[PDB]
Design a protein around this motif. Structure first.
Motif, mmCIF file in Angstrom:
data_model
loop_
_atom_site.group_PDB
_atom_site.id
_atom_site.type_symbol
_atom_site.label_atom_id
_atom_site.label_comp_id
_atom_site.label_asym_id
_atom_site.label_seq_id
_atom_site.Cartn_x
_atom_site.Cartn_y
_atom_site.Cartn_z
ATOM 1 N N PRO A 504 0.804 -1.230 0.000
ATOM 2 C CA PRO A 504 0.000 0.000 0.000
ATOM 3 C C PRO A 504 0.830 1.269 0.000
ATOM 4 O O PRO A 504 0.322 2.322 -0.403
ATOM 5 N N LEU A 505 2.088 1.211 0.436
ATOM 6 C CA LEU A 505 2.911 2.415 0.486
ATOM 7 C C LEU A 505 3.564 2.693 -0.861
ATOM 8 O O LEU A 505 3.428 3.792 -1.407
ATOM 9 N N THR A 506 4.276 1.713 -1.418
ATOM 10 C CA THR A 506 4.791 1.869 -2.772
ATOM 11 C C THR A 506 3.686 1.786 -3.810
ATOM 12 O O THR A 506 3.940 2.056 -4.988
ATOM 13 N N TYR A 507 2.476 1.408 -3.403
ATOM 14 C CA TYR A 507 1.301 1.474 -4.258
ATOM 15 C C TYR A 507 1.416 0.512 -5.438
ATOM 16 O O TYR A 507 0.811 0.731 -6.489
ATOM 17 N N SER A 508 2.195 -0.556 -5.268
ATOM 18 C CA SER A 508 2.442 -1.524 -6.330
ATOM 19 C C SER A 508 2.570 -2.913 -5.722
ATOM 20 O O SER A 508 3.288 -3.095 -4.737
ATOM 21 N N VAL A 509 1.874 -3.883 -6.314
ATOM 22 C CA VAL A 509 1.906 -5.249 -5.799
ATOM 23 C C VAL A 509 3.249 -5.910 -6.093
ATOM 24 O O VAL A 509 3.811 -6.617 -5.243
ATOM 25 N N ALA A 510 3.781 -5.698 -7.297
ATOM 26 C CA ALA A 510 4.996 -6.395 -7.703
ATOM 27 C C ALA A 510 6.162 -6.050 -6.790
ATOM 28 O O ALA A 510 6.943 -6.931 -6.409
#
Ligand SMILES: *[C@@H]1O[C@H](CO)[C@@H](O[C@@H]2O[C@H](CO)[C@@H](O)[C@H](O)[C@H]2NC(C)=O)[C@H](O)[C@H]1NC(C)=O
Ligand SMILES: *[C@@H]1O[C@H](CO)[C@@H](O[C@@H]2O[C@H](CO)[C@@H](O)[C@H](O)[C@H]2NC(C)=O)[C@H](O)[C@H]1NC(C)=O
Ligand SMILES: C/C(=C\CNc1ncnc2[nH]cnc12)CO
Ligand SMILES: C/C(=C\CNc1ncnc2[nH]cnc12)CO
Lengths: 540, 540
Positions: A504-510
């Motif tokens: 949720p912080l880097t806003y990216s799942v990968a």
């Protein structure tokens, strides 16, 4: 007995009844329809949520649809002819705030197109699952992958590193590879490739990611906004008191100037009036309604909340109106005036492109799709087979082969039609919990989806503050998997926490998955080495 | 036997030995010293972390310490005299980027003062706990309240709604009220006011908040920055490629201009070179070192990681140097050159002010302090009493009264000296796990703190990428409390999830608690009403 009973018996004694093994599973016709109706009521919310999330992705059209604008807004471009007056040639910045009108019209058209695409993909997937594998499951676009596709792979209004068409190509190739591996039975080995804690905590990470998305501005009810110091603080001020940000060049005396080429942001900063947005409070009301409908165990909660918020938002001269008094608002109201329409796919059909197969981000997105689909599909399918009581001692339920194959084929078809990959829905549990046991449940849900279409005009007027709590509560439901982590063991705790907080912080799942796996491997390296070395024989 | 044994027996047979009930608790002198040393090694990291976090709060000084500045940086203000040249009078904007030099010097001096204040407060708290209540516990400023005080109540460089002095006044009044309520045995009545799920999940929320703080730029190792669309993405680009943001007034054609009075932000946006900052990788190395030292169950992990990172950063001509080639860097290197110094508190001592008792945020902060302190102190004290085997059947351990009173008095003294509230540390378990059972452990830890001071010059050179992983791993340890939540029951799940997600996103503990309690109360209104109405008699 009763007409219900004649119908049940007649269907049970017919050829079609034997096709789905009705008698052997102890249900004839009416339990199937009840299960199908319950399932449709449980998972109809995708109809709006998926369309909105994919529409925000920017669609298939580029700057080429931005019209030239005038120097002054009070003069329409067609009449922009006079002294000191000229036309501005559209650039990349036309796609973003202030959005060019042509791109807005394109985006609305793509929204309608994606609604129809979602309906068709779900219908076909349900039919294939019900017929080929003969199981009472429902298929539709996944919630977890919707946002990953729309906001990370492609980006907001196409600001990502992968073009929309190449993203669809990546989804297509991933589906094909999944079908291959499911056919040859390496699926278990790959599933065992990932470490346990990362597999357990990825779902919680995705839930937190969806919850964060639901708390933004152009995705949900606001309440989270920009702050110069902490970078995130309490939004939900009125829209009239929101301003944008631009990059500048500081100095060593206090002067500042705007940086040429700054990518202006949307209205994210609040200047006064915190906790006073009527849309936020309407969204809160919808959230509470959905929460009650869930607590009392009433099926169809999210639909009721969405419908209430949307119905309130249809009035024309309110602060929370879904039709604001402008050109786009008037066009949207015009479309919404006609209740029923038959919209036809025009752009997203067959929009594949294999140009970007070289880029690394292409393969990153493909592999993320592949792993998420493998893990979620396997887990949910086995769980539902358990729930229906089809599992034998060895752990297989006979028709698993064709179920996996059907899911892969549905993924491929969804890729062709232009939507994020489709998956089996945990919501199908309701149907199982209602007694349905055969493929008639899937066909009933398919018929209900076919009914859903013909209503594109109504489904196109969902505001963000209506989408909102649905996403938040989906995150709430997803978060329940944290318990399976042994939080007292650091070698297993640290990777899971990294996985949960990076998504949720880097806003990216990968990036979350990569960080989790890397931390796990670095932590366990000493154990791997010591074990292998004792195996060699130097140590004991 | 051995000199260790003569010393043990001699102390055991002395008056002082009977004062702490040495024989009754089956340990004489050396188990006590070993427990104290282990405790100090476990919990020494506060010495740096608390000082850094409180220093970032801006200290006691205001714009009055901003010097007038020249029009051009190449000319020093003293020589700023000539045609078209003038002096800029400092305003609020001097406190922020670009920071005025005088405020930077003030901030460094306040950093030294806060280091000494933390050491003195911890020493006095340990002595009082060890003497009055006679238990082997250690006291020091709390991690959870540190950030809440520094970044929320006061804000970064005093950008909050409460002045620093009034914040200290709030802490003082909170400590006094805690002492009062503890004296009358009314504490347990308040402790039952908060619902169970909120109480359980507040710790996890605070852990996530600390983890987020550790992933920022001016607090930790970077890796989280600003993005125009998602508002958070992947930072850790080199410092030379970071730019600031400013507010802007848009239009309906594409023009843009700066807003007069814009509160410029620090270097938060990365323009190119992601995942290439050496400081981030040095912080990652320190993080992995601490992770190994924790997994192998070696005491003092965090100190080893911090010391390694700081020792590497002490070099002068590197990209990760803690002394960059400027005026402030040269002054810091000058101070660090002298190894040992006796710094004396000059500003933060006796800095209370009761001016703002009217503001609502004052009472919000006071109540948040009060509840956090009540819950954490009660729970941790009872857990440590259990761990030492002092608990009887009724659930009390005799000396609880004076333990709570000593904690309250320590809070008041810390308020007077100018630091966030002081609390008992879970780290004390180590000292108990080694066999210490009496008050000599506290006095040993106090002596070790007294040794720590005399080293202000060395402790003042801790960069953010050194603070960093310590905060992240404290969050990791704190997160373990989620398991006690029944995630299958919505009436208990939803409030807990709200509490967990609101704290790190709104970046404020008080708002998270308020949201959790409000959602809990709203969810149960039907139940309360039905129960009370059946109690009345209309329903059954
Ligand atoms: C777009 O329209 C705005 C007005 O809404 C123009 O603003 C100009 O710049 C500032 C701000 O108003 C004033 O000093 C000028 O007088 C404005 N001129 C006009 C004609 O409004 C802006 O110039 C327009 N876009 C461009 C590219 O000029
Ligand atoms: C502050 O110092 C800078 C040089 O470091 C002065 O130069 C200004 O630079 C900005 C951006 O490069 C220009 O927009 C200005 O036109 C420059 N000013 C001059 C006089 O050359 C800057 O001027 C100084 N601050 C002020 C207020 O003049
Ligand atoms: C890991 C994947 C989720 C993908 N989406 C879904 N996967 C399975 N069932 C669902 N019901 C609604 N959305 C889904 C878990 O978040
Ligand atoms: C609720 C409060 C924490 C306050 N701080 C601490 N409270 C108790 N022991 C500690 N050790 C380090 N920090 C602490 C829990 O985060």
């Amino acid at each position: 007995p009763k007409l219900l009973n004649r119908l049940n018996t007649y269907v049970g004694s017919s050829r079609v009844g034997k096709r789905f093994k009705l008698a052997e599973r102890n249900s004839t016709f009416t339990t199937e329809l009840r299960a199908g109706t319950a399932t449709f009521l449980t998972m109809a919310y995708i109809l709006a949520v998926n369309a909105s999330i994919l529409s925000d992705s920017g669609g298939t059209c580029s700057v080429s649809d931005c019209i030239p604008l005038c120097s002054n807004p009070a003069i329409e471009p067609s009449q922009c002819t006079g002294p000191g007056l000229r036309l501005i040639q559209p650039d990349v910045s036309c796609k973003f705030n202030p959005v060019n009108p042509g791109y807005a019209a394109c985006v609305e058209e793509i929204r309608k197109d994606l609604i129809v695409a979602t309906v068709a993909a779900s219908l076909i997937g349900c039919v294939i699952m019900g017929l080929m594998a003969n199981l009472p499951l429902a298929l539709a676009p996944g919630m977890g992958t919707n946002a990953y596709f729309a906001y990370t792979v492609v980006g907001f209004h196409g600001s990502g590193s992968i073009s929309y068409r190449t993203a669809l190509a990546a989804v297509f190739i991933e589906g094909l590879i999944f079908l291959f591996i499911s056919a040859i039975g390496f699926r278990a080995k790959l599933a065992k490739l990932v470490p346990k804690p990362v597999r357990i905590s990825s779902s919680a990470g995705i839930g937190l990611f969806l919850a964060f998305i639901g708390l933004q501005n152009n995705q949900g009810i606001g309440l989270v906004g920009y702050s110069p110091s902490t970078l995130v603080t309490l939004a939900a001020c009125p829209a009239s008191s929101r301003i944008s940000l631009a990059p500048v060049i500081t100095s060593a005396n206090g002067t500042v100037s705007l940086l040429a080429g700054g990518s202006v942001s949307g209205d994210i900063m609040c200047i006064h009036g915190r906790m006073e947005s009527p849309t936020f409070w309407l969204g809160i009301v919808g959230f509470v309604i959905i929460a009650y409908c869930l607590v009392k165990n009433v099926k169809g909660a999210m639909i009721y909340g969405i419908v209430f918020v949307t119905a309130v938002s249809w009035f024309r001269n309110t602060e929370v109106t879904a039709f604001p008094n402008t050109s786009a608002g008037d066009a949207a109201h015009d479309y919404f005036k006609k209740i029923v329409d038959v919209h036809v796919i025009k752009h997203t059909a067959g929009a594949l492109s294999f140009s970007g197969i070289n880029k690394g981000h292409f393969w990153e997105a493909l592999v993320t799709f592949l792993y998420v689909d493998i893990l979620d599909t396997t887990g949910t399918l086995y769980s539902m087979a358990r729930f229906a009581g089809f599992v034998d001692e060895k752990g297989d339920f006979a028709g698993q082969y064709f179920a996996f194959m059907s899911d892969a084929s549905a993924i491929v078809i969804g890729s062709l039609l232009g939507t994020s990959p489709v998956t089996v829905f945990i919501e199908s549990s309701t149907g199982i919990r209602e007694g349905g046991r055969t493929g008639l449940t899937a066909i009933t849900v398919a018929v209900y989806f076919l009914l859903a279409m013909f209503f594109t005009p109504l489904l196109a007027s969902i505001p963000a503050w209506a989408v909102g709590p649905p996403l938040i509560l989906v995150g709430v439901m997803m978060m329940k998997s944290v318990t399976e982590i042994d939080w007292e063991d650091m070698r297993e705790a640290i990777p899971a926490f990294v996985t949960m907080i990076l998504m949720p912080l880097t806003y990216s799942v990968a990036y979350g998955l990569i960080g989790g796996i890397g931390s796990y491997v670095v932590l366990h390296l000493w154990d791997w080495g010591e074990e292998g070395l004792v195996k060699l024989g130097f140590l004991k």
